[PDB]
Design a protein around this ligand. Structure first.
Ligand SMILES: Cc1ccc(N2CCN(C)CC2)cc1C(=O)NC1(c2cc(-c3cnn(C)c3)nc3ccccc23)CC1
Ligand SMILES: [Zn+2]
Length: 313
């Protein structure tokens, strides 16, 4: 009982291997990886026929090099990255409206939306190999950056993803120490409670798409049971990301940087990227659509920032 698959050690040369289905990939090839997953302790599936597997034997110098260059301690990182890279190298990366995008394939709508957003926000990555991949992605060659996004998010090629979760994971690898957010929460029976958030917690919010509604005050539930009002007191970050579950929202030109439109059910839909240039543009992978006004199911909105201070007494 066998299947025929392809193995690779360099992502350039493929070798047809006949694999025995009664043994795991590990006992036949050593550390084996497929589309961003570790298949070492897994027995071959019928679906694996014709697929390309990355083989990466265990070397202690590789593990140490991964900590220094990728900033990871997961011994499967390199193999998951290399195996995902085999697939992301097969994708097309068109320049849509001056930005590097990804032509739709293997449910990568979320990857394209994240990639297009990353080109419009001031960000510097701490892992040296991630920052190098980021520079190359901005210049057009984005296959390595995409494989690293899948690797840092623990995702596989073909598996749908959330743009907000992807951003959350990537921001943990960005230098956001100088980012600061001061919030005040007011409950009629609890009082006022000021909170100071730093790093990723200072640039992301879940509950509303409007940065103006956040500045004015938003209704959140309090630990007492009553409703409280949370509002933005101070903000010191180069950008802000306001997210909420997909809902019909009106995007007015020049009021935001870029946004993520999500159409369809939870974990079933498709992403489109809306960006505010001289007019509103909608980048749907390799497709582009102009428009003066916009209303659709938005789930993420990014705004520009330097320093904000509330005028609320
Ligand atoms: C595409 C995808 C892949 C993967 C994961 N997960 C997220 C949870 N991780 C732990 C595993 C991966 C989610 C989505 C996803 O659908 N995320 C979004 C989303 C959609 C709706 C939604 C849309 N229509 N309807 C009826 C509901 N509700 C939401 C509520 C809260 C938050 C997000 C919601 C569009 C942001
Ligand atoms: Zn309270």
């Amino acid at each position: 009982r066998t299947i025929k698959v392809f193995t690779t050690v360099d992502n350039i040369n493929l070798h047809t291997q006949v694999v025995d289905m009664s043994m795991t990939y590990g006992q036949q090839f050593g550390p084996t990886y497929l589309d961003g997953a570790d298949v070492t302790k897994i027995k071959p599936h019928n679906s694996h026929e014709g697929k390309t597997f990355y083989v990466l034997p265990n070397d202690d110098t590789l593990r140490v090099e991964a900590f220094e260059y990728y900033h990871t301690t997961d011994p499967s990182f390199l193999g998951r990255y290399m195996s995902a890279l085999n697939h992301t190298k097969k994708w097309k990366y068109p320049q849509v409206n001056g930005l590097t995008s990804i032509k739709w394939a293997d449910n990568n709508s979320y990857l394209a939306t994240a990639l297009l957003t990353l080109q419009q926000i001031e960000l510097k990555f701490n892992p040296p190999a991630l920052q190098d991949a980021y520079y190359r992605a901005r210049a057009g060659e984005a296959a390595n950056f995409c494989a690293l996004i899948l690797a840092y998010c623990n995702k596989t090629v073909g598996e749908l993803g959330d743009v907000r979760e992807t951003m959350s994971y990537l921001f943990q690898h960005a230098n956001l120490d100088s980012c600061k957010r001061v919030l005040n929460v007011v409950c009629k029976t609890c009082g006022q409670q000021q909170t100071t958030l730093k790093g990723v917690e200072a640039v992301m919010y879940m509950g509303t798409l409007s940065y103006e509604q956040f500045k004015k005050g938003v209704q959140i539930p309090c630990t007492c049971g009553k409703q409280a009002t949370k509002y933005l007191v101070q903000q010191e970050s180069p950008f802000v990301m306001m997210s909420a579950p997909p809902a019909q929202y009106e995007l007015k030109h020049g009021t935001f940087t870029c946004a993520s439109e999500y159409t369809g059910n939870y974990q079933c839909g498709h992403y489109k990227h809306i960006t505010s240039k001289e007019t509103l543009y909608c980048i749907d992978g390799a497709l582009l659509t102009k428009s003066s006004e916009y209303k659709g199911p938005i789930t993420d909105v990014f705004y520009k920032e330097n320093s904000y201070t509330t005028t609320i007494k």
